[PDB]
Amino acid sequence: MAAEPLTELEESIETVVTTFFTFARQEGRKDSLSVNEFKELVTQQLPHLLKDVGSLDEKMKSLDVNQDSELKFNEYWRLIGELAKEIRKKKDLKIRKK
Amino acid sequence: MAAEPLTELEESIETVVTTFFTFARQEGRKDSLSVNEFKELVTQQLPHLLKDVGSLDEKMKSLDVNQDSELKFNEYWRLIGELAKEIRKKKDLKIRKK
Ligand SMILES: [Ca+2]
Ligand SMILES: [Ca+2]
Ligand SMILES: [Ca+2]
Ligand SMILES: [Ca+2]
Numbered sequence: 001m002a003a004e005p006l007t008e009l010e011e012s013i014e015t016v017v018t019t020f021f022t023f024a025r026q027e028g029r030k031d032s033l034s035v036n037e038f039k040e041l042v043t044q045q046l047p048h049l050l051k052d053v054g055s056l057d058e059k060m061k062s063l064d065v066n067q068d069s070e071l072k073f074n075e076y077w078r079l080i081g082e083l084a085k086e087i088r089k090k091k092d093l094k095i096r097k098k
Numbered sequence: 099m100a101a102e103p104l105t106e107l108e109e110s111i112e113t114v115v116t117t118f119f120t121f122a123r124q125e126g127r128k129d130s131l132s133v134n135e136f137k138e139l140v141t142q143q144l145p146h147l148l149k150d151v152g153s154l155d156e157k158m159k160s161l162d163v164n165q166d167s168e169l170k171f172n173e174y175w176r177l178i179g180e181l182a183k184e185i186r187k188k189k190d191l192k193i194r195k196k
Contacts, residue, residue, distance in 0.1 A: 007147070009144065010147045012110060012113050013181060016107070019110075046107070047104075047105050047108075049104070073183060074193075080110075080179075083108070084111040088100060097099060097102075098099060
């Protein structure tokens with residue numbers, strides 16, 4: 001009918017952009033992740049990727065290279081990279097993973 | 099290294115990780131994208147999401163900054179951020195800062 005099939009990448013990026021949009025809309029500006037907003041993301045999902053969702057605030061200060069406490073899309077985005085890393089980088093390391 | 103099944107956002111990273119892998123593996127260098135692996139992604143996939151796949155090598159040199167003429171798994175990643183962002187952004191203002 002209608003709802004034109006986007007490409008695999010387009011789709012996959014839209015999929016994270018929408019999730020971003022919701023988690024960005026929670027508090028101040030559907031445009032930045034605030035810290036509580038961020039903590040909600042790691043608390044709500046991230047079951048097996050980024051364990052120690054407690055020490056988020058460290059990660060936040062790392063993603064937010066400027067430490068302005070607006071994690072803009074591009075700053076927040078960092079997380080998705082690290083996620084995409086952790087898939088294999090369970091360590092790198094010792095007592096790693098096959 | 100390797101290998102575990104996951105949740106939703108975890109799927110969205112996996113679904114780009116597979117794409118990454120399928121290109122990364124080409125030459126091989128099953129880690130780093132050469133500019134007949136990289137350029138192939140822009141040529142093949144995009145197709146609408148972003149634009150100026152002609153001056154790919156602009157992006158390449160901007161992405162590549164560790165100077166090893168090989169888009170490593172976390173140079174390459176940058177592009178996914180930009181094309182993600184491009185759903186919003188025009189190339190409004192160019193990304194540069196030290
Ligand atoms: Ca917000
Ligand atoms: Ca910021
Ligand atoms: Ca390669
Ligand atoms: Ca490089």
